[PDB]
């Protein structure tokens, strides 16, 4: 997260880290056994880390639980990035508490201008590389589909939306993928892609979770 702030320990209790020997992606806990992340975060041997603040130190509220299933959307397209969503089943149920909690799925899509909270352990620099110890947060608005398409001609599908600030300086970045965009207590987005990070005229692009609610519910229930 570029241009954000330190969230505070366990203030985003649905945020998880996906670990394959190191942190490589985020995710969002949606019940005690299931996490939502990005399809391009698929790896074998994922371990989900819940209750984290400092990703580099064992601090006392962590739960480390292996993925038992990592299910990429069946129409994920690795060229266009359409349908960039994955569901991860935890091999054992997480113990839910004040620091490890699920986030609700949307009942309807959010509108342009709705303010959301985006979080993760990704790069904090728009040029260069600095990865934080503790979780970072950013408030940002959903942008119009027209502005998103103008920023990224020919690339924005019906399952993507833009969020952020056209002037630059505030965005998600490498290491945030898979993580949450939460708007009025609902998981509306998944960090997906962009042209660099925090560049002028190049807002972040996010998977539009509201289009997948039936698929998420039925897939979780079938596995």
């Amino acid at each position: 997260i570029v241009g954000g702030y330190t969230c505070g320990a366990n203030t985003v209790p649905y945020q998880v880290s996906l670990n394959s020997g190191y942190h490589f992606c985020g995710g969002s806990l949606i019940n005690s056994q299931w996490v939502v992340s990005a399809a391009h975060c698929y790896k074998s041997g994922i371990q989900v880390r819940l209750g984290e603040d400092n990703i580099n130190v064992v601090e006392g509220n962590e739960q480390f639980i292996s993925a038992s299933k990592s299910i990429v959307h069946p129409s994920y397209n690795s060229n266009t990035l359409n349908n960039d969503i994955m569901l991860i089943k935890l091999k054992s149920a997480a113990s839910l508490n004040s620091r490890v909690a699920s986030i609700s799925l949307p009942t309807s899509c959010a509108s342009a201008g709705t303010q959301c909270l985006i979080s993760g352990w990704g790069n904090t620099k728009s040029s260069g590389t600095s990865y934080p110890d503790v979780l970072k947060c950013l408030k940002a608005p959903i942008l119009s589909d027209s502005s998103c398409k103008s920023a990224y001609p020919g690339q924005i599908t019906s399952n993507m939306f833009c969020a952020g600030y056209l002037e630059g300086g505030k965005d998600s970045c490498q290491g945030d993928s898979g993580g949450p965009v939460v708007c009025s207590g609902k998981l509306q987005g998944i960090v997906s892609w962009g042209s660099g990070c925090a560049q002028k005229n190049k807002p972040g692009v996010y998977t539009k979770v509201c289009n997948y609610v039936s698929w998420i519910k039925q897939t979780i229930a079938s596995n």
């Binding site: 490589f24 391009h40 290491g175 993928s177 898979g178 997906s192 892609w193």
Partner: protein, 58 residues
Amino acid sequence: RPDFCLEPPYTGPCKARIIRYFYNAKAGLCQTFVYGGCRAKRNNFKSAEDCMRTCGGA
């Protein structure tokens, strides 16, 4: 033909932080870099051994 082993490493537009290997011809070794998770180019390997096998000595 252009040697893909001589191309600079490509993070791409996705926002993962996945550690991959690329052949760095200036240094004469396989080195690590951050791949964002999509749209990989070919100078992008899952291990040092794969990188050396494909690009060593380029």
